[PDB]
Amino acid sequence: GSSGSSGTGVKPYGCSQCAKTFSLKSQLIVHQRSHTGVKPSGPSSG
Ligand SMILES: [Zn+2]
């Protein structure tokens, strides 16, 4: 089996793009700078 839904608790600093949260703002402020910029392979003649 797998444990879960055991007691509520939602950190104040959480990311929307993903389901990853953090306790320290510094961690988020920096993390947020991950869902932007570098893009995955796309155009061949680009
Ligand atoms: Zn994120």
Side-chain angles (χ1 to χ4, degrees):
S2 202
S3 64
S5 181
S6 181
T8 63
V10 299
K11 302 201 200 296
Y13 315 104
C15 190
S16 207
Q17 289 296 296
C18 69
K20 299 193 270 273
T21 50
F22 315 103
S23 166
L24 309 165
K25 59 202 277 76
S26 279
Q27 291 319 309
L28 181 82
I29 296 155
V30 179
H31 173 91
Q32 273 203 311
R33 299 195 75 163
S34 282
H35 298 282
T36 189
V38 69
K39 62 179 191 201
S41 183
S44 186
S45 68

